[PDB]
């Protein structure tokens, strides 16, 4: 209602859009980065910045760290481990699950409440509708500090165990990776020579948005097969992504598309229907990546 | 209560008869085989013995068999009797069929439509689900309120040949983001830190994610039409440098679905072209012809 406390360590430029943001939330922000000077913008909106890290962490109950590395995290945070008892520490620096899990280890040994995060989306989208924040680790500390996390995004707690968030932005990544190749792929056979063809990715693109909520009706159909280990096939087995992904191969080839998706895919369901799944759901292809 | 004819009762041309019916058409069937038609009769579809009788049946006639072989076997010694009715062919098959089967049909005075249906039969009839068309324009427009009745439709354009490419084009999209999707699971539900959580769980997540990959796939279709692929604040410089993380952390838990590799080729072969700031668009050059 009235603003709380929050610092900011980091002024590069997504810790700056963050301090930004809390500013435009209302929230009463204090800046620290290693070297002087990045910080006079912020200034102007109402930031306090000051000298040293030490007298930011003291300046504010929740302490949000945005840093190049988590070898950077350490080198600011280590000195501090007095200084941090008591407060919660939001780690949205960029790194591997395993030093998401040792950092969060130090904050309890030196009792302070460690939620780790990942910012789904570049500077520009910071404070903005539907971009995503993912945390994991403290409940205590997302339950407390959602109010004013708010302010950066939409905040998702993915759970107790530190390490998750990591997990998750390289999931998620691969998951958008995957989108935009299919969509890749699906531009250049729509805009190549042919009949059908000569169509803009821009008119493919109006009709792919609306066929993206049927791909997410798959996706949420076949989430549960993979966590029961059952498969059913029902009216789409992989006899028929086998046949339609040959038929997409050779539409490829033909028009001069070539991305190594459809090697990939045939590859992939050969070897399930080769093993005698033909029958089964596209879920039953966990079992032959992991 | 439009006049609508069905001219195939497999599983999916059934379906549609159904969705027909559903919306209060006056819906006429025909099968090739007698017996498959009891269920929609009952349902209030007129069933009739040939196919003459059915195209005589309806102005529109809606067309759902196993192949462009089969739709000529059936609709060619009907030619006199199509002209001045809408034709809307549903068969899947091959842009060069599509043309030339709409050739065809001009030639005898039908105006035709062919389309793609982007669900199964369960999802006929039902929200959200795409029926894409392409060809003629004045039978879209004619027909659509009645074509209605089987899920969203949707007009590609006036050749006729679009729907089939469009539907090979999407299907190459949902088994990018299904890929994507299946690798992420298996990430996820790994053993090591982070990990063992459940495909139901990341699938909650990456639902609210997929906004955001559609807000990337909106800003690059431009770059495409345009040739200029400005990479802004995430250029492929930044995609190779995360999908290298990307492979770095499937080999450790034990994930082998071939796409980290495909990416981090790709984007390099942009990068070494001198592309590292451009957009993920500018990978189209890398792909096409
Ligand atoms: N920008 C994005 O689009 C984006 C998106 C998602 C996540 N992230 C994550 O956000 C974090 C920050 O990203 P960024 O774009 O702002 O820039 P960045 O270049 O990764 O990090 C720059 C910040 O790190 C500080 N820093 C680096 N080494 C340090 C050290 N040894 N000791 C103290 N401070 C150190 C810099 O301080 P100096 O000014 O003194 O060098 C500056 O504040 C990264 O982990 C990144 O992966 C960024
Ligand atoms: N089912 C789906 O999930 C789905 C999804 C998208 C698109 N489609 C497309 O919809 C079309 C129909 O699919 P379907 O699932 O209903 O099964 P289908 O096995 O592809 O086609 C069965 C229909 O074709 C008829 N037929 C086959 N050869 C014929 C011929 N020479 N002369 C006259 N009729 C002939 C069958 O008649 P009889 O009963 O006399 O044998 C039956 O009515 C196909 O092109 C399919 O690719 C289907
Ligand atoms: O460095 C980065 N700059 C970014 O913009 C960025 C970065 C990393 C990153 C760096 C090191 C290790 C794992 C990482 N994951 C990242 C990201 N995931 C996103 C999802 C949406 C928008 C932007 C990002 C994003
Ligand atoms: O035969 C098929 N049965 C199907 O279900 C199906 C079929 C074909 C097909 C056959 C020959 C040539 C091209 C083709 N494209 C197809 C499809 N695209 C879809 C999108 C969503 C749900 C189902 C489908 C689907
Ligand atoms: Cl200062
Ligand atoms: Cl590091
Ligand atoms: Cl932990
Ligand atoms: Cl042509
Ligand atoms: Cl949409
Ligand atoms: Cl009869
Ligand atoms: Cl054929
Ligand atoms: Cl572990
Ligand atoms: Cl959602």
């Known amino acids: 209602h009235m603003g709380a406390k929050v610092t900011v360590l ?3 430029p997504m810790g700056a ?3 930004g943001a809390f500013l435009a939330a209302g929230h009463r922000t204090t800046v620290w980065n290693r070297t002087p000077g990045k910080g006079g913008s912020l200034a102007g909106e109402g930031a306090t910045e000051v000298a040293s890290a030490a007298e930011a962490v003291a300046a504010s109950p929740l302490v949000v760290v945005c840093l190049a590395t988590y070898e950077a995290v350490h080198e600011v945070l280590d000195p501090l481990a007095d200084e941090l008892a008591g407060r919660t520490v939001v780690n949205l620096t960029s790194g591997s699950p395993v030093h998401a899990r040792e950092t969060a280890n130090w904050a309890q040994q030196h009792g302070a409440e460690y939620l780790d995060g990942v910012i ?3 500077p520009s989208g910071i404070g903005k509708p539907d971009y995503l924040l993912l945390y994991s680790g403290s409940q205590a500390a997302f339950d407390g500090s959602r109010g004013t996390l708010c302010a950066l995004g939409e905040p998702m707690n993915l759970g107790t ?3 998750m968030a990591s997990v998750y932005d390289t999931a998620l990544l ?3 990776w995957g989108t935009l190749t299919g969509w890749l792929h699906g531009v250049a056979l729509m805009g190549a020579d042919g009949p059908g063809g000569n169509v803009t990715a821009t008119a493919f ?5 609306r066929w993206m909520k049927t791909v997410g009706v798959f996706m949420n159909t076949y989430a549960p097969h993979v966590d029961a280990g059952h498969y059913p096939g029902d009216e789409f087995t992989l006899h028929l992504h086998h046949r339609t992904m040959n038929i997409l191969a050779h539409a490829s080839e033909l028009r001069g598309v070539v991305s190594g998706l459809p090697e990939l895919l045939t590859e ?3 070897r399930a229907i080769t093993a005698g799944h033909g029958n089964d759901s596209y879920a039953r292809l966990v079992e032959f990546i992991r």
């Open 174 to 176: 691969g998951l958008m």
């Open 10 to 12: 980091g002024l590069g």
């Open 205 to 209: 693109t109006e009709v792919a948005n």
């Open 17 to 19: 859009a963050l301090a």
């Open 161 to 163: 165990d530190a390490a």
């Open 268 to 270: 992939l369901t050969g």
């Open 120 to 122: 789904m989306t570049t």
